[PDB]
């Protein structure tokens, strides 16, 4: 009865809030929602594997529509030896350290690794974030190349260079057409014992006021599979008005789709594995301001993550 | 290749009809449809489990839209010992004996059992029935507490008290805003040998003409997993105009969404397991009348249930 | 952890193009898309099985909407002995050799085989093709009976007779109501060693200019599960203006929904299994013309199929 497909997944019960209305839910300052994902990992052969993930989001109490299931991921991974790998279809792409974009991606990905230095090249389109709601003609294409070297036993540094074509992006709720963008950046990720010190800087060369950077300190040994593991970190975000932030890997409430004059503030988050494969995560963004000094709304998070 | 997720499901081919048009399908007196559900039961750890169910409904011959898959269930079950259990997310809630509501429920559920007496407390929102099509602000919240005691070896009696906040409910196809409702009720379920005698009574204290009750007799040993098992029962429904019937557990064609002056009539249903995990079910509602004596339309059912 | 359900599926990355715009994508002459399907094969009992398939289509770069998951197949298969089989629900029906229709089908199917001669009878509605977008009342019902005999060790010939009721079909993008149609046809499928020579002819007796036929030659031993297997074939299509072509089993770009005066041209396609359960398929339709001699647009195909 067993085949080549292995079924995994996760469940999440998340709470989001803010001191002002509209940050997470329209005309309100709170949002409680749940997520259920089921992933099918299939072994096509010894060197080829295919991953299909079905995802469903619902809001607690929202019965206007059902929780429609959408194919979040659909891609095939090829292992062309021991150092070369390739992806094609609908997968997850991390542009740089994830500050610019870490979300769904349609296209192809090429990997050339050496266990101490890694080269990744991706060509395709972004799906979520400011790239959401764009047709194929209106969606800018991303030609991304990235370098990642291991500076220590587990610390790593790297950089990237990306090229975005003309397309429509969501700027403060308004889709505007932008010219070509050449986005380059660098990142660092140091991890000594339990201490963590990471940072990332990115900028679009041709667009002014496009600089965005982040930096944070952490301490912990969090692992959702191990009970009792905990983590604490506090990171600072400084992104300008024209900084390309489509779907960031971090949990700040402000990106290109929500801000018209950039974002600048701190965020403290904690993690705790209450049980095995069960983790409690909380976050609190404070001192949120625009690049002109205008105060923004403080935001806070609390979610429960179940892994199976 | 095996993980923590076990895949189950069911399939149904159902036929519904009536002597008048509009009871089941608009502008017609018949409805043939099929249902396919796939459920993923996952063991997060020794004391935590998560259930995700994907459901798809289609009509025989309706090709206007595809059979969109919706996440019917998405919840996590915790076992806090041997007597305390907890649920959270999108699950199934039975308010009382199921006459008032037995369908999808967003919120949290707490269980305290003793193997002879059980206490269940739920807080959240109803999704299907008269609560369908309501946003989070317009969906009334349910604060439900229920008691269930075992009066015999397998017979049981119980009661419940529910509190519904202000919200919009579907009354005869029209969504009207209602004030707070305090719904209380009692039920009995006697099962001696093969004979079954059950009944339920519920009423909203502050709303007049809100009384609803049912009673039925049965005889059989139906079990879909066992071939040759059969069941027959005949039950009578008497629900008034303002009686809260959102999504009843029984198969009467008339509830709050379809009736403007209540429902009152009999219903005879039969069950038969033609094969293992295959069951043939039929039903026939007759003598359907309003609370004022106006005749309603007789309805009849026939479905095939496949379990896997 | 293992149950009665076995999980299979497939993934596809397809490219389609033409010399004229609108053949595959509106206002463009190209279309790159991907497909991911997950099928759940369940054993209800020793003689009953149920199949549920979840399907998701996405376009590379189209982020206007998510890849909604739809239940492509939902049906139950019964084995009433060793020669009689039955299907019910949403399955795949091949009307004749597949030239007229080979796609989703709602209804019931009966099979009576003898390992050398087979009789198949289906009653229901077509879902895809020219039958897409039709409600239950507007969808014509198909009463189909088919005969298939084995003329050689692996060659086979057969025929069919179909009866279509009044209903709406998509004719060149316009849904028109048509009277009853009695469609009959014959087919032949010869397979000697690696050579293949097949053909099919169909016609609606009461509709004029409803004749449609195809013929092709092939050579290969293609099997996606075996690496290195390859196939080549070239087939010719001659279908008239009123010929019923709802969802053909072949890959010609022109059918009843796209053509107003029929289709007539050649098509050469190749297959190659680059890896185990991975296959590369290409096609090229050329010399496309109408039944009046007006030139149509040449089309070409290229897809990658992954099986798991």
Residue numbers in the entry:
A (entry chain B), B (entry chain A), C (entry chain C): 113 to 420
What did the paper state?
The VpOmpM1 trimer is pseudosymmetrical: while the β-barrels exhibit three-fold symmetry, the stalk is tilted relative to the membrane plane normal. The pseudosymmetry was confirmed by enforcing C3 symmetry during data processing, which resulted in a better-resolved β-barrel region (2.8 Å) but uninterpretable density for the periplasmic stalk. The β-barrel of VpOmpM1 consists of 16 anti-parallel β-strands connected by extracellular loops and periplasmic turns similar to the E. coli porin OmpF. VpOmpM1 extracellular loops 3 and 7 fold into the β-barrel to form the constriction. The eyelet (the narrowest region of the pore) is formed by sidechains projecting from the β-barrel strands into the lumen as well as sidechain and backbone atoms of the constricting loop residues. The inter-protomer contact area, mediated by hydrophobic sidechains on the outside of the β-barrel, completely excludes lipid/detergent and solvent. The β-barrels exhibit other features common to known porin structures, including an aromatic girdle at the membrane-solvent interfaces and strong density surrounding the β-barrels that likely corresponds to the lipid moieties of LPS and phospholipid or detergent. All-atom MD simulations show that the pore constriction in VpOmpM1 is constant due to an extensive interaction network restricting movement of the eyelet loops 3 and 7.
